[PDB]
Amino acid sequence: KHNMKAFLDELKAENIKKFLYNFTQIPHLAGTEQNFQLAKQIQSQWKEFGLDSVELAHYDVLLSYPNKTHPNYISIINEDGNEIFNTSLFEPPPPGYENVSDIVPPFSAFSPQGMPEGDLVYVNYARTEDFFKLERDMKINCSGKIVIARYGKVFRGNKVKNAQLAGAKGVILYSDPADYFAPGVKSYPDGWNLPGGGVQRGNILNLNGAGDPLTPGYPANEYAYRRGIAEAVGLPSIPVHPIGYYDAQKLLEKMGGSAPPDSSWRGSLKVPYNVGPGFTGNFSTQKVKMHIHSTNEVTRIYNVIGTLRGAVEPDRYVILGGHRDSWVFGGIDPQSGAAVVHEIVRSFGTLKKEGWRPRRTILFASWDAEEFGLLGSTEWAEENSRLLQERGVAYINADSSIEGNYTLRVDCTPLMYSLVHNLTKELKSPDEGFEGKSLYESWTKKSPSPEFSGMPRISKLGSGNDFEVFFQRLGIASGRARYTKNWETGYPLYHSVYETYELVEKFYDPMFKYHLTVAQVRGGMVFELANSIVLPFDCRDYAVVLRKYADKIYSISMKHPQEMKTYSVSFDSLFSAVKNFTEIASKFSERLQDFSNPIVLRMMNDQLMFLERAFIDPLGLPDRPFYRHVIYAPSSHNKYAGESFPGIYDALFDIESKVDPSKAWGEVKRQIYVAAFTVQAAAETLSEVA
Amino acid sequence: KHNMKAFLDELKAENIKKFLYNFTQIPHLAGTEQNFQLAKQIQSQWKEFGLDSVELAHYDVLLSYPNKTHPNYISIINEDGNEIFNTSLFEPPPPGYENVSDIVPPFSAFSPQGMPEGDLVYVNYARTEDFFKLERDMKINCSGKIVIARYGKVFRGNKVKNAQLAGAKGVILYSDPADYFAPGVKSYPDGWNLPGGGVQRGNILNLNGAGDPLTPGYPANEYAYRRGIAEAVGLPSIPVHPIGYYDAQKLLEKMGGSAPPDSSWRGSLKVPYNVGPGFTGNFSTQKVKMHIHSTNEVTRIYNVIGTLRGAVEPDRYVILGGHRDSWVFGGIDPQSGAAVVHEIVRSFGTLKKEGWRPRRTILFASWDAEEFGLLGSTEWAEENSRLLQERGVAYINADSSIEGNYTLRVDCTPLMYSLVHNLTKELKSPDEGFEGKSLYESWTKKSPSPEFSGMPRISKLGSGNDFEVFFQRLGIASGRARYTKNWETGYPLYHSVYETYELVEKFYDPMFKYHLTVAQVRGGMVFELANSIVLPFDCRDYAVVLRKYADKIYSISMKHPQEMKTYSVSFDSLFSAVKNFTEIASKFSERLQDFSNPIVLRMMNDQLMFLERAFIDPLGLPDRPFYRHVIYAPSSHNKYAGESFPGIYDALFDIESKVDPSKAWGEVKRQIYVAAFTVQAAAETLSEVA
Numbered sequence A, B: 001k002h003n004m005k006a007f008l009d010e011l012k013a014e015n016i017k018k019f020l021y022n023f024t025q026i027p028h029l030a031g032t033e034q035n036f037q038l039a040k041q042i043q044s045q046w047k048e049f050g051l052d053s054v055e056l057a058h059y060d061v062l063l064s065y066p067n068k069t070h071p072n073y074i075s076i077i078n079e080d081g082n083e084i085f086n087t088s089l090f091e092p093p094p095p096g097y098e099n100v101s102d103i104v105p106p107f108s109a110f111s112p113q114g115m116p117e118g119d120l121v122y123v124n125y126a127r128t129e130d131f132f133k134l135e136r137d138m139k140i141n142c143s144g145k146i147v148i149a150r151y152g153k154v155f156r157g158n159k160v161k162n163a164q165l166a167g168a169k170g171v172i173l174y175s176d177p178a179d180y181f182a183p184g185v186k187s188y189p190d191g192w193n194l195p196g197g198g199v200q201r202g203n204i205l206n207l208n209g210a211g212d213p214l215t216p217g218y219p220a221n222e223y224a225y226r227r228g229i230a231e232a233v234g235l236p237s238i239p240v241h242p243i244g245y246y247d248a249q250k251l252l253e254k255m256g257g258s259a260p261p262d263s264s265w266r267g268s269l270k271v272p273y274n275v276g277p278g279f280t281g282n283f284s285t286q287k288v289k290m291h292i293h294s295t296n297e298v299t300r301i302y303n304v305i306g307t308l309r310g311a312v313e314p315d316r317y318v319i320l321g322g323h324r325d326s327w328v329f330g331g332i333d334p335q336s337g338a339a340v341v342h343e344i345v346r347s348f349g350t351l352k353k354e355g356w357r358p359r360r361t362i363l364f365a366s367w368d369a370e371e372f373g374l375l376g377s378t379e380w381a382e383e384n385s386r387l388l389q390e391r392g393v394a395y396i397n398a399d400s401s402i403e404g405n406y407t408l409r410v411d412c413t414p415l416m417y418s419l420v421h422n423l424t425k426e427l428k429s430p431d432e433g434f435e436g437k438s439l440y441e442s443w444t445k446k447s448p449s450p451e452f453s454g455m456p457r458i459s460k461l462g463s464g465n466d467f468e469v470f471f472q473r474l475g476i477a478s479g480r481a482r483y484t485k486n487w488e489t490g491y492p493l494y495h496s497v498y499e500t501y502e503l504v505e506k507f508y509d510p511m512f513k514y515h516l517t518v519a520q521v522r523g524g525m526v527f528e529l530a531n532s533i534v535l536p537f538d539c540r541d542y543a544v545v546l547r548k549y550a551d552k553i554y555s556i557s558m559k560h561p562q563e564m565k566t567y568s569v570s571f572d573s574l575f576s577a578v579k580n581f582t583e584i585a586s587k588f589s590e591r592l593q594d595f596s597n598p599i600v601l602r603m604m605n606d607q608l609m610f611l612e613r614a615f616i617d618p619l620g621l622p623d624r625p626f627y628r629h630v631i632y633a634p635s636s637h638n639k640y641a642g643e644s645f646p647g648i649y650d651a652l653f654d655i656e657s658k659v660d661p662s663k664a665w666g667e668v669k670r671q672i673y674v675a676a677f678t679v680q681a682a683a684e685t686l687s688e689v690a
């Protein structure tokens, strides 16, 4: 039989292992020859595996690289201008890789060039609230200072934006052992902890969904007209560089000025964590000097796009995509996800060779330049946006399959909650102590829902990965699934040269059973989306969450009862719309189970497919035209986190500090109107069509 | 048999006559009680006629009215401040209507209040080129002057915008007999000419597709959050008032300063048509003073929405819409179109009562407040934009069925050219001398295509009517058809109290046979769109026009060969895309004729339906976010006229006068890129889907 079980049984842990090993022997940095060679290999194999067509889609996009003959580093400089201490030029390479060429040294992608010199201020995680505390409470002025921030909690691009708006003239990012060294575990190669010489690479853009900084709105094809650099989207205006905690210790140990305001500002190094500005008395005339010489360069990138044509609805697309480019070896990020995709393609291809076809078309994608700002997925979606928004059923992401070995982690649209519950009930748990139990059971036990007994936690989609264009710009139902750690007791070697095949095989998943379970969840979701007669979306689950988010945003507003009275701020319209959505969704579900008629079915599947689409506002969110989903957007303070009713949330945020309350409260009301209208409009797409 | 012929034969000239008479006995000004009563009547009758559901959709929108107890007028004032001449407070009412109440006096809707006093400048038609001539060639400065302009050639809103940007402090619009009095025809009531006391009403907004000035983007429902007036869209900043040619003569006869620059600046009045500024020597100290006291007021409006549910594809909508509100009696505009719609509904309902249903759903609309800026159709489309863009097959407009009695006039998307050719070949010509000949034959003879022998002229869609939101914002294939005059040898009584039932019955269409022919063209188009198995769109006709527009825009650029060399401006990408579109369209047409399979069919009908949709850019055109169609937009100089490749056109327009040519030519190239990409993207929606 050619059914989901056949698909699932064909997936092998041993294949995923072989592919991971294959994909992680050399670096595959976006825009490099090695990553083009890997693209060609994947293309060749997906064809071998049996896909109907497999093409490269290339774009010329803005990327960023250090200067090979003018290295980036940071100094402490004395009053004579002698550099008395220099940060490292490279991470010590791991065992057996000390002769691998083309390891890009640690750098912050898209930093401008410069050699700013100044006094340090320590800004904790450089979050919005950290700067509030410094500026409003501690009265510390960052203007003209070099800020040093620890990585963690929020996307590093947001840190840089926040430092820039505070007036900083440079940013130093570092990995504190408090956030990247788990007590009682050894440093790589003897354990999975970050060594003192390890450094996290990563871009520091604020693209807000734009894709290639030079071509917002349109694919960066051969004839594209490019913005000049001064008008590019999302580039930082101050130099930025990341360091490890051996080097950080040397920069922090001399810090003077004010004490940290409390213990949430102290990491694990043997230093006081003084905020500054500047160094204590004896070293007061020493300064910190950055030397950054990286260059932004338009560079060719290559997506691989595989097609498995649907037998019945070839014009309906279910997309499985994840990136291929890596900072260095990509042992977890992304090749632990790419090896899973490769095995998924292999399995579907086995069925195809025996005469099977899915009902709908399945598209498989190996995205390029994800690490430089989701550039490959976004350019391809800009190119194909008309096909995607009229034909896109769902997008399943497939980056890193693991960041831990504890339990499942799923982030998705409410439209997929029931699909995910049902599927995981049919999968075997790989967890110790749950042999013979379902994945649903182990996941529910280890990660209970905060609101529903006997159900697992499922998180909202944020951003910082390739689903962003499909979900937040285009309104295509999206989901992701991986194995994660127990947050009560992400991974230390993230974006370091130490993230290798050996890291995974030795310390995360020696038997590749967590990879296999992730392949079954991702593959199974795709199978059901592409094959179920009725799309496996339950609009009633959206109704439930919409009420929860409405309660939540109302509560935030209700911290300001006097202003709500003065400006007549009412959430009545939003609750009314949510109530209507609930009633219409319930009635639609009845019809969906109560209708031999393929027009009614396809009519109903179109209503299901266009439901996520209905939450898109074509005017976008304020000052973020590529975030158009009115229910979800990436947090304005942290691109990784999802925010619900983001337009209202941002209008309320820090509202007590606005100098014109009338104007600020009017904008709250405007966003309430936009949200109520959008929920009601979405609900009406589920009404009888005539 | 229940077929198109049955539908067409049921339509009666005598019914249209009866309905026109019924709809034109009292004024039906938007926002008034009489127009609400008419809405209720239409709703009741459409139900009686047999539609499945007929609802009112109401909105609260910004409208504009004179002050009943503080009348608008213009004076010539002497140096003592005595008003020595006053324009009329009302048009002399026509025979038998001298006791009709609630005739709104002539005014320019949405004029601000004021009493500016100054010297006149005469600006011909107040077109972009008229102001160029004044300012650049004649060196006449309009700053602080009251401009007097003749109606005609372009939408009056554009005139006002152009006067405002020239620095005018007021605008006087008037109807010159050169443009509103045909030689050898008598004035109303003895003929169809405008009398000297007749005055054209009309709004002077520049909305650029926004709809209600207070709620751009979102329907003006009960909980809508409104912009404050100072932020409203499209309101003029200077007072404006329209007058007839008896009054105009009195204002123009004393004009001094420079002579008109040439004969294209002279109308038909016995005056010199001096441009001014100001009056000749003896009257040099007299000035012109306007008194405007109209008020903008948020007012309720009502659309009637009728549904005839489709038997097979109820989730596919073919829309027949036209407005119901009128300036006064609306004898032509709009009731000659609304009576035609009413008879069309009646006919479809007759078939429905005998057990017939169209294949697709047909929506019938009676729009309100069209005369105040397309407000009713636009608010309803904003409300229902998600249903319309995923389900909208086509929109057929139905305003004024006649402006003449000479031949057919059709404006539509190229997707409907073949449909229109085929249909008119099956209809009887109503023209004298063509008895027993087809409508196609008479129309082709009287209005030949400028490029193709043996084919009729079909024009591009501009704006200034209710299709605007469906076509230019949402990308739904749109068309219109009416009877027109012979432009070689629109109508004089437009928007005057003289536009009555009697005007039509006595002078335009005594037998109502032109109305009947228009009902057959509009009704027949709807019938075929709603009933043909394969949508009756020929994508190859778009390919042909795209090449013509590409040739045209290239030619405009080629007036600047040196700049095209300097800035490397190439149209190669646009021609390549158009070539690709032509090849793909040809291949798609082959498949369309070469495929019993309803999924392939509906797949192919979706490709047909989403083809117009593919020309929409969700970022809109520069500074006009509600004009999103990249092939067509209303002319930036004249909202009535369509412009092809509008983004490139506007980038090239007057480019030799731009102070930074590098920047201006870069924007030409950017628009070429957007256009080539959009054509290629549209073409790819017609490729095999997987």
Ligand SMILES: *[C@@H]1O[C@H](CO)[C@@H](O[C@@H]2O[C@H](CO)[C@@H](O[C@@H]3O[C@H](CO)[C@@H](O)[C@H](O[C@H]4O[C@H](CO)[C@@H](O)[C@H](O)[C@@H]4O)[C@@H]3O)[C@H](O)[C@H]2NC(C)=O)[C@H](O)[C@H]1NC(C)=O
Pocket (backbone or CB within 6 Å): A573, A574, A576, A577, A580, A676, A677, A680, B222
């Ligand atoms: C959720 O769904 C319900 C449908 O079950 C929908 O109810 C609608 O609410 C609107 C807005 O409240 C109602 O609008 C009214 O319509 C009547 C005509 O039918 C008008 O006369 C009303 O206006 C008068 O009263 C107003 C309020 O006091 C005044 O401001 C105004 O000046 C007039 O005096 C009013 O517009 C509408 O009838 C119902 N429709 C129904 C029950 O079918 C509700 O809007 C949906 N929620 C959202 C957020 O869309």
Ligand SMILES: *[C@@H]1O[C@H](CO)[C@@H](O[C@@H]2O[C@H](CO)[C@@H](O[C@@H]3O[C@H](CO)[C@@H](O)[C@H](O[C@H]4O[C@H](CO)[C@@H](O)[C@H](O)[C@@H]4O)[C@@H]3O)[C@H](O)[C@H]2NC(C)=O)[C@H](O)[C@H]1NC(C)=O
Pocket (backbone or CB within 6 Å): A222, B573, B574, B576, B577, B580, B676, B677, B680
């Ligand atoms: C109309 O349809 C045709 C398809 O029939 C489509 O043709 C495509 O044109 C593009 C852009 O010209 C071609 O792109 C090339 O692709 C190859 C790889 O296949 C690249 O190596 C090329 O880049 C090199 O050469 C460039 C130009 O000299 C350099 O700028 C560059 O630096 C590289 O050296 C180039 O990107 C593409 O292969 C074809 N596709 C085909 C033939 O299938 C055409 O683009 C369509 N028109 C529009 C407006 O889309």
Ligand SMILES: *[C@@H]1O[C@H](CO)[C@@H](O[C@@H]2O[C@H](CO)[C@@H](O[C@@H]3O[C@H](CO)[C@@H](O)[C@H](O)[C@@H]3O)[C@H](O)[C@H]2NC(C)=O)[C@H](O)[C@H]1NC(C)=O
Pocket (backbone or CB within 6 Å): A418, A419, A422, A536, A537, A538, A593, A594
């Ligand atoms: C996840 O699995 C659940 C449990 O199987 C699915 O819900 C069930 O779906 C079936 C099929 O629609 C329902 O069966 C129907 O029962 C009604 C009688 O009430 C009958 O009218 C229909 O003909 C049909 O037999 C069943 O009631 C329902 N069970 C529930 C809600 O407990 C659910 O659909 C799955 N979610 C997916 C696939 O996204």
Ligand SMILES: *[C@@H]1O[C@H](CO)[C@@H](O[C@@H]2O[C@H](CO)[C@@H](O[C@@H]3O[C@H](CO)[C@@H](O)[C@H](O)[C@@H]3O)[C@H](O)[C@H]2NC(C)=O)[C@H](O)[C@H]1NC(C)=O
Pocket (backbone or CB within 6 Å): B418, B419, B422, B536, B537, B538, B593, B594
């Ligand atoms: C307007 O009317 C014309 C003329 O009738 C329509 O074109 C014709 O459409 C029919 C139906 O598709 C074509 O018939 C086909 O012929 C081919 C053989 O070449 C065969 O493969 C098919 O099975 C079918 O019989 C016909 O060729 C074509 N005639 C032309 C182009 O001259 C046209 O479709 C109409 N336009 C509309 C409805 O929008």
Ligand SMILES: *[C@@H]1O[C@H](CO[C@@H]2O[C@@H](C)[C@@H](O)[C@@H](O)[C@@H]2O)[C@@H](O[C@@H]2O[C@H](CO)[C@@H](O)[C@H](O)[C@H]2NC(C)=O)[C@H](O)[C@H]1NC(C)=O
Pocket (backbone or CB within 6 Å): A067, A068, A069, A070, A071, A295
């Ligand atoms: C990358 O940097 C190189 C080399 O930088 C040189 O060596 C460094 C250690 C430091 O001392 C720099 O100031 C040196 O210039 C750049 O190559 C130099 O470019 C200049 C002209 O721009 C030239 O006159 C020098 O001779 C070059 N030096 C060498 C060693 O070749 C190069 O421009 C940079 N690459 C980029 C920006 O992409």
Ligand SMILES: *[C@@H]1O[C@H](CO[C@@H]2O[C@@H](C)[C@@H](O)[C@@H](O)[C@@H]2O)[C@@H](O[C@@H]2O[C@H](CO)[C@@H](O)[C@H](O)[C@H]2NC(C)=O)[C@H](O)[C@H]1NC(C)=O
Pocket (backbone or CB within 6 Å): A071, A073, A075, A081, A082, A083, A084, A085, A086
């Ligand atoms: C810190 O480094 C500086 C600069 O060193 C150069 O650039 C580095 C990236 C690396 O590639 C070095 O090998 C380069 O020499 C040192 O200061 C320089 O020292 C040299 C030799 O003494 C002298 O000629 C230069 O003028 C110095 N340049 C500057 C900009 O000061 C410095 O000694 C190092 N400090 C420590 C403590 O190691």
Ligand SMILES: *[C@@H]1O[C@H](CO[C@@H]2O[C@@H](C)[C@@H](O)[C@@H](O)[C@@H]2O)[C@@H](O[C@@H]2O[C@H](CO)[C@@H](O)[C@H](O)[C@H]2NC(C)=O)[C@H](O)[C@H]1NC(C)=O
Pocket (backbone or CB within 6 Å): B067, B068, B069, B070, B071, B295
């Ligand atoms: C419309 O205008 C009326 C009446 O205007 C008055 O009569 C005119 C001929 C002229 O002389 C005006 O200046 C007069 O005011 C407005 O009603 C007046 O409003 C003021 C206060 O705003 C009041 O004190 C007067 O007594 C009113 N006059 C009368 C005759 O009632 C009215 O406000 C206007 N309607 C609008 C703006 O909607």
Ligand SMILES: *[C@@H]1O[C@H](CO[C@@H]2O[C@@H](C)[C@@H](O)[C@@H](O)[C@@H]2O)[C@@H](O[C@@H]2O[C@H](CO)[C@@H](O)[C@H](O)[C@H]2NC(C)=O)[C@H](O)[C@H]1NC(C)=O
Pocket (backbone or CB within 6 Å): B071, B073, B075, B081, B082, B083, B084, B085, B086
């Ligand atoms: C032109 O009209 C003005 C104003 O007349 C008033 O407003 C008109 C709209 C209309 O409703 C008239 O009946 C109103 O009286 C005339 O000037 C006014 O004359 C009266 C009486 O002589 C005087 O008391 C006012 O102060 C004047 N008002 C102003 C603003 O000047 C004027 O006489 C008319 N001119 C001609 C040639 O008819």
Ligand SMILES: CC(C)[C@H](NC(=O)c1ccc(F)cc1)C(=O)N[C@@H](COP(=O)(O)N[C@@H](CCC(=O)O)C(=O)O)C(=O)O
Pocket (backbone or CB within 6 Å): A153, A154, A155, A202, A203, A333, A370, A371, A372, A373, A374, A399, A400, A462, A463, A464, A465, A490, A491, A638, A639, A640, A641, A642
């Ligand atoms: C620690 C990790 C799970 C992180 N999430 C958060 O830190 C986070 C914080 C608060 C919250 F409520 C939710 C998530 C996160 O989402 N990481 C992402 C980052 O993946 P990638 O390294 O492939 N993406 C790149 C590029 C992202 C971009 O440019 O947008 C990067 O972050 O540098 C991921 O794993 O999907």
Ligand SMILES: CC(C)[C@H](NC(=O)c1ccc(F)cc1)C(=O)N[C@@H](COP(=O)(O)N[C@@H](CCC(=O)O)C(=O)O)C(=O)O
Pocket (backbone or CB within 6 Å): B153, B154, B155, B202, B203, B333, B370, B371, B372, B373, B374, B399, B400, B462, B463, B464, B465, B490, B491, B638, B639, B640, B641, B642
């Ligand atoms: C004379 C008439 C045919 C005019 N067209 C042009 O003047 C014109 C000029 C140059 C050109 F290349 C094409 C058309 C035109 O399009 N009129 C429209 C105006 O209809 P309506 O009076 O109902 N519409 C209102 C409201 C328009 C609006 O607010 O946008 C009005 O114009 O005041 C129509 O008849 O559809």
Ligand SMILES: *[C@@H]1O[C@H](CO)[C@@H](O[C@@H]2O[C@H](CO)[C@@H](O)[C@H](O)[C@H]2NC(C)=O)[C@H](O)[C@H]1NC(C)=O
Pocket (backbone or CB within 6 Å): A021, A022, A023, A025, A040, A041, A044, A045
């Ligand atoms: C990863 O696996 C691929 C595919 O098996 C290897 O590429 C092949 O290498 C062999 C032997 O050199 C060639 O004959 C084939 O043509 C290649 N096949 C392709 C590219 O499809 C590749 O060598 C492996 N890489 C590593 C590091 O083990």
Ligand SMILES: *[C@@H]1O[C@H](CO)[C@@H](O[C@@H]2O[C@H](CO)[C@@H](O)[C@H](O)[C@H]2NC(C)=O)[C@H](O)[C@H]1NC(C)=O
Pocket (backbone or CB within 6 Å): B021, B022, B023, B025, B040, B041, B044, B045
């Ligand atoms: C226009 O036609 C309508 C419909 O026939 C007339 O409205 C009807 O008037 C009669 C007699 O007064 C009433 O009994 C009906 O209830 C009305 N029907 C409706 C509103 O559906 C209307 O009087 C006619 N108007 C004119 C000016 O002739």
Ligand SMILES: *[C@@H]1O[C@H](CO)[C@@H](O)[C@H](O)[C@H]1NC(C)=O
Pocket (backbone or CB within 6 Å): A141, A142, A143, A144
């Ligand atoms: C911070 O420092 C600079 C002085 O260089 C000053 O211009 C700026 O306004 C200061 N801000 C605050 C809040 O004190």
Ligand SMILES: *[C@@H]1O[C@H](CO)[C@@H](O)[C@H](O)[C@H]1NC(C)=O
Pocket (backbone or CB within 6 Å): A192, A404, A405, A485, A507, A508
């Ligand atoms: C794998 O699981 C064990 C057992 O719970 C745990 O102690 C260990 O830390 C895990 N490895 C990783 C990399 O999380």
Ligand SMILES: *[C@@H]1O[C@H](CO)[C@@H](O)[C@H](O)[C@H]1NC(C)=O
Pocket (backbone or CB within 6 Å): B141, B142, B143, B144
């Ligand atoms: C027109 O008139 C005013 C003087 O009131 C002046 O400020 C303006 O710049 C003048 N423009 C030209 C082009 O002369």
Ligand SMILES: *[C@@H]1O[C@H](CO)[C@@H](O)[C@H](O)[C@H]1NC(C)=O
Pocket (backbone or CB within 6 Å): B192, B404, B405, B485, B507, B508
């Ligand atoms: C109707 O047709 C006649 C005959 O051509 C023409 O002379 C007359 O002007 C027309 N009436 C109108 C209103 O155009």
